[PDB]
Design a binder for this molecule. Sequence first.
Ligand SMILES: *[C@@H]1O[C@H](CO)[C@@H](O)[C@H](O)[C@H]1NC(C)=O
Ligand SMILES: *[C@@H]1O[C@H](CO)[C@@H](O)[C@H](O)[C@H]1NC(C)=O
Ligand SMILES: *[C@@H]1O[C@H](CO)[C@@H](O)[C@H](O)[C@H]1NC(C)=O
Lengths: 125, 207
Amino acid sequence: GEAARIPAAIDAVIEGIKSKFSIDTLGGEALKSVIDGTNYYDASYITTAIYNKFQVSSCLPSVPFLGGPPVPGAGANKPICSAVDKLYLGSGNFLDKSSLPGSIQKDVAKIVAGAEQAAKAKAAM
Amino acid sequence: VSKKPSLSVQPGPIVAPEETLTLQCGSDAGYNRFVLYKDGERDFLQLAGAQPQAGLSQANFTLGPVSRSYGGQYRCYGAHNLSSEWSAPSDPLDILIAGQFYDRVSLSVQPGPTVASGENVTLLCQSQGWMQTFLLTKEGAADDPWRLRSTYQSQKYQAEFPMGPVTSAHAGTYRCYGSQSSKPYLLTHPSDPLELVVSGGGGLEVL
Ligand SMILES: *[C@@H]1O[C@H](CO)[C@@H](O)[C@H](O)[C@H]1NC(C)=O
Ligand SMILES: *[C@@H]1O[C@H](CO)[C@@H](O)[C@H](O)[C@H]1NC(C)=O
Ligand SMILES: *[C@@H]1O[C@H](CO)[C@@H](O)[C@H](O)[C@H]1NC(C)=O
């Protein structure tokens, strides 16, 4: 059942990502189209892929290059920015450009661990 | 643009290395988020969330162990939501890092060890090495320190802080620091503390 196992693990991690980060089905297929390799267990690669495809850098406030006031950011209206804000910026919580990748990576690692733990055990039973 | 927030520092604006400073950024304009910037740097230091209650919200930004890099001017901004435009900059807060030079400074009473009731208290901060400015601070009254430009006198660099006629409010523990020209937010090690005690109307140094 090796083919079933590798395809099913990929589907499970994609579904976990879509659940945690409130990513629509379309974003799920966008992630699937690059995660189909044997990179589905590496939270680092998934975090970089999420950053690139969903433009998480555009969620944070930015300051103009030649001088200006801080602005909300190009993607602040996109759903990914609202999801990131709820997940990592509550009342009494803090965030910076360096901390966000690690937080997203930790949660993606939880997704991968849970997906394969549950998949292996049910199939073995 | 919305009215600026308020930026305060606790315990005080002058901090020693390996210490953490709580910068409080607050407002009454119903802001759920606050952002901190330093010296014009395009990347924000910290973004914080604060649930407004009747419009009043405060974010207690925690600077990490402080180093020579933390010295400078800080401004915080407030926003109503993730997509809303940011407020006007808060008034700038100057954060100074101590223990950055080997040169030592000394704090003394220029009138002398004891000051009489009708006499004035003058605090002298001095150093053997070249300093551009000297800063005077009082314990507990942790506000913006008193900075005076140094003068070359008696083959030393020194500044006199005239506190006026002896009063009971002059009592307390005092420390002075030195700053050089290129890096005004980097300070020397604190001088040895000078405790002033009110005795018989007069002031005395207590060790
Ligand atoms: C910050 O501290 C003040 C007073 O200690 C408190 O009123 C406020 O709710 C605190 N804010 C956060 C985000 O902890
Ligand atoms: C964000 O705040 C602005 C006011 O600055 C308001 O007009 C807008 O509706 C708010 N957006 C959301 C999603 O709450
Ligand atoms: C200091 O005290 C003297 C008298 O002891 C007085 O003449 C002088 O005005 C005081 N200093 C200042 C700045 O007023």
